[PDB]
Amino acid sequence: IEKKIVLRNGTEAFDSWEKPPLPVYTQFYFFNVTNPEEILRGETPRVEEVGPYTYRELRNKANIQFGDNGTTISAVSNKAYVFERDQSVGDPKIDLIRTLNIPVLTVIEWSQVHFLREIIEAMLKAYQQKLFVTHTVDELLWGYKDEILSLIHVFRPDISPYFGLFYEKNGTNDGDYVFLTGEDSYLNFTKIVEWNGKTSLDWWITDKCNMINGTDGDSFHPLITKDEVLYVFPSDFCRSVYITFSDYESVQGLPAFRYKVPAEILANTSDNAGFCIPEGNCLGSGVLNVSICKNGAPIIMSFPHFYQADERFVSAIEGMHPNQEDHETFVDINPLTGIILKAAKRFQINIYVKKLDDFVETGDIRTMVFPVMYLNESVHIDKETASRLKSMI
Numbered sequence: 001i002e003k004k005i006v007l008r009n010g011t012e013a014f015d016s017w018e019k020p021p022l023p024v025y026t027q028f029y030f031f032n033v034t035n036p037e038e039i040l041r042g043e044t045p046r047v048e049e050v051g052p053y054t055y056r057e058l059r060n061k062a063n064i065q066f067g068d069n070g071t072t073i074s075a076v077s078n079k080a081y082v083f084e085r086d087q088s089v090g091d092p093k094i095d096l097i098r099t100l101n102i103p104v105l106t107v108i109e110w111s112q113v114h115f116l117r118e119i120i121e122a123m124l125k126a127y128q129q130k131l132f133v134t135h136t137v138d139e140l141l142w143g144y145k146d147e148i149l150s151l152i153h154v155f156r157p158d159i160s161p162y163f164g165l166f167y168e169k170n171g172t173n174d175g176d177y178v179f180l181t182g183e184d185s186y187l188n189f190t191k192i193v194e195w196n197g198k199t200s201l202d203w204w205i206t207d208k209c210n211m212i213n214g215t216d217g218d219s220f221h222p223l224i225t226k227d228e229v230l231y232v233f234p235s236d237f238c239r240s241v242y243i244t245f246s247d248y249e250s251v252q253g254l255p256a257f258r259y260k261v262p263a264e265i266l267a268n269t270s271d272n273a274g275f276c277i278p279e280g281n282c283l284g285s286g287v288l289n290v291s292i293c294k295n296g297a298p299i300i301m302s303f304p305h306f307y308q309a310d311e312r313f314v315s316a317i318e319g320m321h322p323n324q325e326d327h328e329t330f331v332d333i334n335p336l337t338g339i340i341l342k343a344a345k346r347f348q349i350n351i352y353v354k355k356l357d358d359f360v361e362t363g364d365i366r367t368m369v370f371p372v373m374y375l376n377e378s379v380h381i382d383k384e385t386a387s388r389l390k391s392m393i
């Protein structure tokens, strides 16, 4: 039986789970801001799309421990990025990007006491701080010492002087996980049952929204059916997500079902009401306020170029040209085994920006969801692992 697919010491399923043989890549694309001064005078932003900066991933399950009479398994999943110049537009240690000053907007947000806010402006004034700043791709991705934060750190040692979109993420894991192994039922293969000791999330408004559904998205139960909907808990996206069957496809020499992230996921629906922290008040279709889980930083999640989002989000920023073939999230799963043969996980990091009377640095900036960068975390099965699998398929 395809019951061969269980996380039990000695199975091939286990080994490929513990030491993933498939090479995963992350490609970074940034939006270079061309008119900072004009943006501050209330004009429409104009951005230029820079990328890729291709990094090959290094993945490994650590701290593995079995449980509940072989029903469960606990582990962490370490991810490290190795830069590939040959596959990139340029050197991230040289190439520059003018974008928003996330540390300053992050600090302005954190302040809701007048004294606190008076202190911050004083520092911005004195230090001649700006809303639009230029850094290397490397500094933006991996971290740079910020002047304002360095000074805050002196008074509040809990506050880090460093900032990066992926700061302290090279080598680390996304917390402790306890997975249900396919021993009790195959449908229950790699199903997440706990994340950081909690069986559910606590940062959303409704019981439904806070649910931890599905697998980490790196695998799925065997014997899938064209009609079922598949759930994924992408830790980074801060909520569970489901994917729906699109069509049949052939990867290497193996059959697959093309599963895509449907529009409904981030649409302004009743089932997505609880993803709106201001007492139900929603920003709009195609965007997620990930502020609660991003330690108060004004981060807004979306899909690249605001694909599957409200037209107003696209009109807002000049240089946004969404399309399905370039911005969608798909995954080609071999139906029999549940093994991902080809995939593309694509999402965008945005900042919620607006004119603040207390902060001259904002000027007359339009109230908007500002694009910073998006990525393409992708996978493609190799001829060696594919041939190995054809024996089973």
Ligand SMILES: *[C@@H]1O[C@H](CO)[C@@H](O[C@@H]2O[C@H](CO)[C@@H](O[C@@H]3O[C@H](CO)[C@@H](O)[C@H](O[C@H]4O[C@H](CO)[C@@H](O)[C@H](O)[C@@H]4O[C@@H]4O[C@H](CO)[C@@H](O)[C@H](O)[C@H]4NC(C)=O)[C@@H]3O)[C@H](O)[C@H]2NC(C)=O)[C@H](O)[C@H]1NC(C)=O
Pocket (backbone or CB within 6 Å): 027, 029, 051, 052, 304, 325, 326, 327, 344, 346, 376, 378
């Ligand atoms: C991670 O995700 C990103 C997307 O966010 C990917 O990057 C994109 O890669 C696309 C291809 O995968 C790029 O799209 C191309 O852009 C070209 C112009 O910039 C355009 O010319 C290309 O069009 C051809 O391909 C289409 C199919 O996709 C065809 O329908 C079309 O007619 C074109 O056909 C070619 O041209 C003639 C006419 O038929 C033929 O003689 C050729 O043989 C045809 N070739 C092929 C292969 O069909 C296409 O739209 C896009 O530029 C790029 N964008 C960015 C920002 O990077 C990453 O690739 C992705 N995955 C990985 C693993 O990297």
Ligand SMILES: *[C@@H]1O[C@H](CO)[C@@H](O[C@@H]2O[C@H](CO)[C@@H](O[C@@H]3O[C@H](CO)[C@@H](O)[C@H](O[C@H]4O[C@H](CO)[C@@H](O)[C@H](O)[C@@H]4O)[C@@H]3O)[C@H](O)[C@H]2NC(C)=O)[C@H](O)[C@H]1NC(C)=O
Pocket (backbone or CB within 6 Å): 032, 033, 034, 050, 095, 096, 097, 098, 134
């Ligand atoms: C993202 O957008 C930003 C802003 O537009 C952009 O940054 C700019 O990059 C250019 C280089 O591409 C920088 O220009 C240099 O500036 C220094 C002085 O500050 C000059 O000495 C340099 O002079 C050279 O110019 C020519 C070669 O480029 C030669 O003819 C000449 O002899 C010199 O060698 C050069 O002008 C500029 O400093 C930045 N601007 C800012 C705000 O930092 C960035 O490159 C864009 N990113 C991408 C990847 O497109």
Ligand SMILES: *[C@@H]1O[C@H](CO)[C@@H](O[C@@H]2O[C@H](CO)[C@@H](O[C@@H]3O[C@H](CO)[C@@H](O)[C@H](O)[C@@H]3O)[C@H](O)[C@H]2NC(C)=O)[C@H](O)[C@H]1NC(C)=O
Pocket (backbone or CB within 6 Å): 208, 209, 210, 211, 212, 213, 231, 239, 240, 241, 242, 271
């Ligand atoms: C996490 O997972 C649960 C279960 O997988 C999700 O809840 C499920 O949501 C669907 C629709 O929101 C419910 O189905 C409904 O069935 C009725 C009856 O046929 C139909 O009228 C509706 O149109 C709809 O199809 C389903 O009952 C419900 N199940 C449970 C156990 O709650 C939940 O939404 C997911 N949460 C996240 C954040 O992904």
Ligand SMILES: *[C@@H]1O[C@H](CO)[C@@H](O[C@@H]2O[C@H](CO)[C@@H](O[C@@H]3O[C@H](CO)[C@@H](O)[C@H](O)[C@@H]3O)[C@H](O)[C@H]2NC(C)=O)[C@H](O)[C@H]1NC(C)=O
Pocket (backbone or CB within 6 Å): 112, 277, 278, 279, 283, 289, 291, 292, 296, 352
């Ligand atoms: C994105 O989510 C954040 C929360 O993560 C939203 O911020 C919250 O905004 C509300 C207003 O709708 C703030 O509530 C009020 O705050 C004052 C000051 O403390 C208080 O006296 C009032 O009684 C009320 O609670 C709330 O403080 C704030 N939450 C946090 C944690 O900062 C934000 O509005 C969302 N962004 C967008 C663009 O919608």
Ligand SMILES: *[C@@H]1O[C@H](CO)[C@@H](O[C@@H]2O[C@H](CO)[C@@H](O)[C@H](O)[C@H]2NC(C)=O)[C@H](O)[C@H]1NC(C)=O
Pocket (backbone or CB within 6 Å): 080, 081, 082, 083, 142, 170, 171
């Ligand atoms: C992320 O961490 C990894 C592991 O420390 C880095 O990759 C290796 O480590 C050193 C870095 O100087 C070098 O031997 C090679 O670059 C890598 N070797 C192997 C065998 O992987 C990686 O460079 C770090 N990435 C970033 C973005 O800093």
Ligand SMILES: *[C@@H]1O[C@H](CO)[C@@H](O)[C@H](O)[C@H]1NC(C)=O
Pocket (backbone or CB within 6 Å): 009, 010, 064
């Ligand atoms: C698998 O095999 C033996 C069972 O005696 C055990 O010592 C070993 O540590 C197990 N492997 C893992 C990764 O736990």
Ligand SMILES: *[C@@H]1O[C@H](CO)[C@@H](O)[C@H](O)[C@H]1NC(C)=O
Pocket (backbone or CB within 6 Å): 184, 185, 187, 188
């Ligand atoms: C996993 O699934 C099987 C049947 O689908 C069931 O017996 C088992 O209790 C499941 N666990 C949970 C908590 O859903």
Ligand SMILES: *[C@@H]1O[C@H](CO)[C@@H](O)[C@H](O)[C@H]1NC(C)=O
Pocket (backbone or CB within 6 Å): 268, 269, 270, 282, 283, 284, 285
């Ligand atoms: C979202 O939908 C609800 C009704 O379903 C509506 O009250 C709300 O204003 C809509 N959000 C936006 C941003 O228009």
